[PDB]
Design a protein around this ligand. Structure first.
Ligand SMILES: O=C([C@H](O)CS(=O)(=O)c1ccc2cc(Cl)ccc2c1)N1CCC(N2CCCNC2=O)CC1
Ligand SMILES: [Ca+2]
Ligand SMILES: [Ca+2]
Ligand SMILES: [Ca+2]
Lengths: 50, 232
């Protein structure tokens, strides 16, 4: 149920492991300190307009 | 693309155009990385030999930002057949890498179970291409895009006497005259999630274009994420 509302507050991917939200990101992104946001790791990250 | 609108600068940067031996665009593709383009398996049977153009916005004019890449290898799905159009997916490895720049950037690959549950359940996606602007119409010299609603599975299956499989999905309109069309084949269907675009479909087939009670059929990318990863 954890990812069913507001995507678990994740910017990108949301999963549930041992009854807690785990966020993750696409290749070329890294998880921010807060464990929710996805920060590009370089120029021209995937899925962004130029 | 039937209806919709022209892509603005920066807007559709993952669009690729497959060009045949006569230099005519005949299918689209989606940039996945510096070396790999996603397209439809059926596109491979439209031209013996072809190349891939990126950064193209206007097919009749030189821009100074567009580039043509030759294909090193074609990776076609083993289970595609012309009889079913099932497994309509291929990956192209380019001979020389793409330099990402204005109007040239990759779409994100989604993550399977998350995308099935959260991305495919969005109201709409966006399809883009240089294909015909109506059934029997001329191709577009300008890159176009169109917002298309996801169609529920039962309405989808009932729309055709052809078998629409679990590896396909429908998007578009019942009667509104907007759809993808011939020449958009192989191109991107993307879905936005929180300001990031994920490639969710490959333009595959329709019964004509924009017909009443007919939808666009797309290869379901989530059904092939491991296959794509292995191919790349
Ligand atoms: O009419 C067509 C063409 O698809 C019509 S088209 O080239 O204008 C075209 C192409 C791609 C499109 C993609 C979207 Cl999302 C929407 C509209 C599209 C329109 N046919 C007869 C049906 C055949 N077919 C499939 C099912 C399995 N066996 C077949 O023969 C495919 C071919
Ligand atoms: Ca051009
Ligand atoms: Ca998952
Ligand atoms: Ca229709």
């Amino acid at each position: 149920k954890l990812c069913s509302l507001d995507n678990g507050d994740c910017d990108q991917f949301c999963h549930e492991e041992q009854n807690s939200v785990v966020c993750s990101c696409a290749r070329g992104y890294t998880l921010a300190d807060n464990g929710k946001a996805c920060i590009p790791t370089g120029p021209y990250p995937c899925g962004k307009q130029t | 693309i039937v209806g919709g609108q022209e892509c603005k600068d920066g807007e559709c940067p993952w669009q690729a155009l497959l060009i045949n031996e006569e230099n005519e665009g005949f299918c689209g593709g989606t940039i996945l990385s510096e070396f790999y383009i996603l397209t439809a398996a059926h596109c491979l049977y439209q031209a013996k030999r072809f190349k891939v153009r990126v950064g193209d916005r206007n097919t009749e004019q030189e821009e100074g930002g567009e580039a043509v890449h030759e294909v090193e290898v074609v990776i076609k799905h083993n289970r595609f057949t012309k009889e079913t159009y099932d497994f309509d997916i291929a990956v192209l490895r380019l001979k020389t890498p793409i330099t990402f720049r204005m109007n040239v950037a990759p779409a994100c690959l989604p993550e399977r179970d998350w995308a099935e549950s959260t991305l495919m359940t969005q109201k709409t996606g966006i399809v883009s291409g240089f294909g015909r602007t109506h059934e029997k119409g001329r191709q577009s010299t300008r890159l176009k895009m169109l917002e298309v609603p996801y169609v529920d599975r039962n309405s989808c299956k009932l729309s055709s006497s052809f078998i629409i499989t679990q590896n396909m999905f429908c998007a578009g309109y019942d009667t509104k005259q907007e759809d993808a069309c011939q020449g958009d084949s192989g191109g991107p269907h993307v879905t936005r999630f929180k300001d990031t675009y994920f490639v969710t479909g490959i333009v595959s087939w329709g019964e004509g274009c924009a017909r009443k009670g007919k939808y666009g059929i797309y290869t379901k990318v989530t059904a092939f994420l491991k296959w794509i990863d292995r191919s790349m």
